[PDB]
Amino acid sequence: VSLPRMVYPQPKVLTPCRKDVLVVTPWLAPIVWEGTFNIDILNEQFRLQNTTIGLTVFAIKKYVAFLKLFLETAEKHFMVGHRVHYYVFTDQPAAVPRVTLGTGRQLSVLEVRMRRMEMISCERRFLSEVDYLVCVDVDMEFRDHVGVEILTPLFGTLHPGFYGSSREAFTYERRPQSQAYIPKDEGDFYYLGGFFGGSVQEVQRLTRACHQAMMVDQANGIEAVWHDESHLNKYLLRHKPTKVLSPEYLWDQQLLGWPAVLRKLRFTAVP
Amino acid sequence: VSLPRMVYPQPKVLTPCRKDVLVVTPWLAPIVWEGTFNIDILNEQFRLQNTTIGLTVFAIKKYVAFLKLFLETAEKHFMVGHRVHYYVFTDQPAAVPRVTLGTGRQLSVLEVRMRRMEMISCERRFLSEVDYLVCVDVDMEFRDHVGVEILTPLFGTLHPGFYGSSREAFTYERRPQSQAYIPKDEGDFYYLGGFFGGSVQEVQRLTRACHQAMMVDQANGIEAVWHDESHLNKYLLRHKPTKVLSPEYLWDQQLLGWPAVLRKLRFTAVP
Ligand SMILES: O=c1ccn([C@@H]2O[C@H](COP(=O)(O)OP(=O)(O)O)[C@@H](O)[C@H]2O)c(=O)[nH]1
Ligand SMILES: O=c1ccn([C@@H]2O[C@H](COP(=O)(O)OP(=O)(O)O)[C@@H](O)[C@H]2O)c(=O)[nH]1
Ligand SMILES: OC[C@H]1O[C@@H](O)[C@H](O)[C@@H](O)[C@H]1O
Ligand SMILES: OC[C@H]1O[C@@H](O)[C@H](O)[C@@H](O)[C@H]1O
């Protein structure tokens, strides 16, 4: 379908949006920073396709206390104007708070008792209900826009403690006996376990692969240094994401401040 | 499928590849420039999928004289290592020169008598034979690498006489009675009629749409200022390409020199 007529500033080939940061990976995936995207054009494109986004959150034992702020801030900032289906995985269905949702948005509570990967790979339901899955930590809050600019077949998010580091400094799993093993001379980025996603197909592949690798490590008496994050990082090394989210998309202002290079802090740790 | 282990320089989030040029459109499509891509990673990715690329060229009447240099330079520079199927559309089958081709590459002569769009929309054959179609002018020669970095569902190429211009300066069709009409305040870029492409599906859509719009203009006694290029530009305005090729991909050194911003001249006009 054709975009309607729209009026917006012209891109200029000879003036970069951002000259301070890398905005495209070497396999030609956009790195999403403020100033790189016109949200109006993106909103039009995803709306024309009637895109539905699923958002998965786990809230088990004490973590149920984080849902109320998580959800209420999601209502302000996460895919507003688009269809959204929250999937809350919890051991305590009656501790899920009652959060008023905007039109076109709905919330399912799934009772459950490193196995987020496993639980995410609920497979037939997701395929019939949403186009994209976004998989985040619950101990977080949205503080600014997190929209359709993220959507793509496969994305991860650059780890805040790690974006300036040489790769030998990255906390990849370094022991060869782990399936998550990455040697010292390999690696593009350090991606966070707490904010990843993609098409339902690609996320099911990812979560399947990672769950299979963690089972293999288990049977071999090995647990990867950073658990499911370590396996994610090996997956994304071998299967390059089609977008990378900048640290704007997962930050901790208490621990890391608010540097100039981050024009927006969109989704952050809770105090 | 998983990429094998590979060793290559680390991307650095805090050091851009290119700070002199826009490398991502505002709808998050890569703009392909030298220094933005690691060809080794891209080659691995497209090879794992056994990608076949079709290259369509029209060589009608006197233009048959251009085929020999076109083809021989294509053999040196165009998708080398990948499977390639040249489709030469000509009124003179016996004037197609005999050009030795590398392994995994083949050439079909199609006899024919603004209607490139029409002829390109040969529909069932392309779908069964190639993954991507690239559609270029014949009066051209390859001088450097033109590879898989271009491939994507839909691409155009930024016009050399126009990449620094404000949009009101672009030679879009400006009369409202043409289907190719773009007003003064709209437009992202000026794309060349001579180098476009995409998945077979997306190119058939494009060529279909443009052929339909040119038929409508015909029945109304109108011909767009720059013919099929004008319609391409309207199409790509309303359906944004998923990559944009920089002017490295279509240049005229005689007329425009070799500016510093172009690190490579890959495909150029013939003297
Ligand atoms: O119900 C949960 C449990 C964990 N997490 C996230 O995953 C991280 C670590 O998981 P886990 O607690 O199992 O590791 P541990 O804290 O026990 O060492 C937490 O810090 C959170 O940011 C979450 O979102 N919901
Ligand atoms: O057999 C042909 C005829 C044209 N062209 C390309 O399309 C352009 C213009 O087409 P055409 O010649 O129909 O316009 P005209 O030159 O007659 O004004 C030429 O300059 C070429 O760059 C081509 O590749 N092959
Ligand atoms: O080195 C990787 C680790 O770095 C810590 O800052 C983070 O809190 C961990 O969850 C993990 O990402
Ligand atoms: O203004 C658009 C025109 O610009 C000319 O340089 C080019 O040779 C034409 O074919 C067309 O692109």
- Per DSSP, helices labelled H in chain B are 39-48, 67-77, 116-120, 123-129, 200-219, 228-238, 253-256
CA-to-CA distance for A28 and A36, rounded, in angstroms? 14
Residue to test with chain B: of A5, A7, A10, most B Cβ within 10 A: A10
Distances (CA, A) of B114 to B141, B181, B218: 22, 17, 11
The DSSP output letter for A94 is G
Q: Dump the DSSP string for B204-260.
A: HHHHHHHHHHHHHHHHTT---TTTHHHHHHHHHHHS--SEEE-GGGSB-HHHH---T
Longest dimension (CA), chain A: 60
3-state secondary structure of A136: strand
Helix (H, G, I), strand (E, B) or coil at B77: helix
A191, amino acid identity: Y
Residue spans of beta strands (DSSP E) within chain A = 31-32, 52-59, 83-90, 105-111, 132-136, 140-142, 154-157, 195-199, 243-245, 267-269
Q: In a 3-state reduction of DSSP, which class is residue A109?
A: strand
Per-domain boundaries in chain B: 1-271
Judge whether B261 is closer than 8 Å to chain A, CB to CB.
Answer: yes
Instruction: Yes or no: say if A186 and A237 are a contact pair by the CB < 8 Å rule.
Output: yes
Q: How was this structure determined?
A: X-ray
Q: Judge if the beta carbon of residue A63 lies within 6 A of ligand 1.
A: yes
Say if residue B259 is exposed, middle or buried (CB neighbours under 10 Å; 0-12, 13-18, 19+).
exposed
Distance from CA of A227 to the nearest CA of B (A): 21
| Other CB atoms within 10 A of residue A208 CB | 16
| Contact state of B22 with A14 under an 8 Å Cβ cutoff | yes
Q: B35 with B15: CB under 8 angstroms?
A: no
CB within 8 Å: A240 and B27: no
Task: Identify the CATH number of the domain defined by range A1-271.
Answer: 3.90.550.10
Paired with A140 in beta bridges are A269
> What are all long-range contacts of A103-106, with beta carbons under 8 Å and residues at least 24 apart?
A105/A75
- Which 152-171 residues of chain A touch chain B by CB within 8 A? 158, 163-164, 166-167
Q: Which of B2, B3, B8, B24 to mutate to test the interface with A (most CBs of A within 10 A)?
A: B24
Angle at A98 between CA A97 and CA A100, to 5 degrees: 135
Beta carbons of B89 and B59 less than 8 angstroms apart = yes
Is the Cβ of A259 closer than 8 Å to some Cβ of chain B? Answer: no
Among A116, A157, A167, A226, residue to substitute to test ligand 3 (most atoms within 8 Å of Cβ): A226
**Residue A151, amino acid:** L
DSSP B24: B
Q: Which of A43, A70, A76 is nearest to A56 (CA)?
A: A70
Tokens of A21: 């940061």
Determine the atom of ligand 4 nearest the C-alpha atom of B192: 12
Q: Which of A75, A141, A173, A229 is catalytic?
A: A229
Instruction: Please indicate if the annotation marks A138 as binding a ligand.
Output: yes
Geometric angle at alpha carbon B73, from B72 and B74, rounded to 5°: 90
- What whole-number distance in Å separates Cα of residue A118 and Cα of residue A102? 30
User: Which pair of structure tokens corresponds to residue A110?
Assistant: 């799934």
Label residue A72 exposed, middle or buried (CB < 10 Å: 0-12, 13-18, 19+): middle
* Pairs from A251-258 (Cβ < 8 Å, separation ≥ 24): A251/A160, A252/A160, A256/A160, A256/A161
Distance of CA B142 to the CA centre of its chain: 13
Can you list the positions of beta strands (E) in B98-208?
105-111, 132-136, 140-142, 154-157, 195-199
- Considering only CB atoms, A14 lies closest to which of B8, B16, B21, namely B21
Cα–Cα distance measured from residue A244 to residue A24, given in angstroms and rounded to the nearest whole number: 8
Tell me which chain B residues have a C-beta less than 8 angstroms from the C-beta of A26. 8, 11, 17, 36-38, 41
Other beta carbons within 10 Å of A263: 14
Q: Are A197 and A155 in contact (CB under 8 A)?
A: yes
Asked if residues B206 and B121 have their Cβ atoms less than 8 Å apart, the reply is no
Interatomic CA distance for residues A29 and B52, integer angstroms: 22
Say yes or no: CB of residue B229 within 6 Å of ligand 2.
Answer: no
Q: Report the distance separating Cα B107 and Cα A73, nearest Å.
A: 58
Residues 32-71 of B with CB under 8 A from A: 32, 36-38, 41-42, 45
Distance CA B55, CA B87 (A): 6
CA distance from start to end of chain A: 44
Residues 195-254 (A) with a CB less than 8 A from some CB of B: 237-240, 243, 246
Length of chain B: 271
Q: What is the DSSP string of A26-93?
A: TTS-BEE-TTS--HHHHHHHHHHTT-EEEEEEEE-GGGGGGHHHHHHHHHHHBSTTSEEEEEEEES-G
Beta-bridged to residue A132, according to DSSP, are A53, A199
Rounded to whole angstroms, what are the CA distances from A97 to A67, A77, A87, A113, A268?
Answer: 7, 18, 13, 19, 20
Q: Which residue among B75, B141, B149, B229 is the active-site one?
A: B229
Per CB-CB distance under 8 Å, the chain A contacts of B7 are: 185-186
**SS3 (DSSP) at B264:** coil
Helix pair A200-219, A228-238: axis angle to 10 deg = 120
Say if strands A132-136 and A195-199 run parallel, antiparallel, or are unpaired. antiparallel
Inter-residue contact A183 to B7 (CB < 8 Å): no
